[PDB]
Design a protein around this ligand. Sequence first.
Ligand SMILES: Cc1ccc(NC(=O)c2ccc(CN3CCN(C)CC3)cc2)cc1Nc1nccc(-c2cccnc2)n1
Ligand SMILES: O=C1NC(=O)[C@@H](c2cn(-c3ccccc3)nc2-c2ccc(F)cc2)N1
Length: 265
Amino acid sequence: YDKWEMERTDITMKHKLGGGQYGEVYEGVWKKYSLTVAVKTLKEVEEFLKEAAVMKEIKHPNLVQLLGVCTREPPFYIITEFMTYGNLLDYLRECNRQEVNAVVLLYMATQISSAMEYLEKKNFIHRDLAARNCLVGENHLVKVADFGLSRLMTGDTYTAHAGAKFPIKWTAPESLAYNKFSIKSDVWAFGVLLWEIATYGMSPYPGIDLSQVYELLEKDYRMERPEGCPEKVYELMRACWQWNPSDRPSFAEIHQAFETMFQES
Ligand SMILES: Cc1ccc(NC(=O)c2ccc(CN3CCN(C)CC3)cc2)cc1Nc1nccc(-c2cccnc2)n1
Ligand SMILES: O=C1NC(=O)[C@@H](c2cn(-c3ccccc3)nc2-c2ccc(F)cc2)N1
């Protein structure tokens, strides 16, 4: 047992988080610090433990933070911080837009690009970047997470493809075509995430059937600039959606771009 192991009794387990929305994830309390936490449990063990191992290597203010694990006897736990306002997609859809205004949106985008710049530097790939996988805390804190939603979400967000489950409208073309994932396919998804933010959580390619998406992209179709979107933000989206992965900017470049816009605003 390493430095991450914590005693089961350190955590008060409360109810399942969001009525199964997240699978076997529970809201808990880290008693000694009076902090609310999220606790993922295991009803497969290999994948579970591999996740914990990845998380031990990630430390950034805009990434969900591992706090501990319980691995001595079942059920095993992965414990992370809990974020006050929950997932970004629902947050955007339900917020007061005078309060969560343009400067807040720029701040959120900046934080997300910072997280991704970090994963980029560490040679990690996210593979499912989207507003549904981000969390919002007080004072507009935003953290990137990965909830493993493809196997929990009901509806058309994820649909079968290449014998797997893909969120087609967030998926880079090369990932769709040749099942190739890289930090540049995350950059593509980040562009879609910008559009989610810009529209306060609309579904992308609205009114366009999933069946048409890949062909449209292949023939150079791209979502148009959302109402109220600054040209500079839209330029970033278009750069993220370059057909060729090597033509897309790095997260380092994206973050620098947003840093500048945020401070200017
Ligand atoms: C309890 C838990 C356990 C594991 C994780 N895991 C991650 O969030 C995560 C993030 C990044 C990576 C990095 N990884 C690199 C490799 N690629 C392929 C995948 C991504 C992995 C896991 C989160 C949580 N936290 C969590 N889970 C579900 C819901 C909530 C939650 C809900 C509402 C409010 N606050 C929190 N919180
Ligand atoms: O009504 C709106 N339309 C939008 O696109 C959004 C918006 C407005 N500004 C803005 C910024 C500065 C001045 C005026 C407007 N910046 C954004 C934005 C969109 C996506 C993103 F990731 C981050 C920010 N608000």
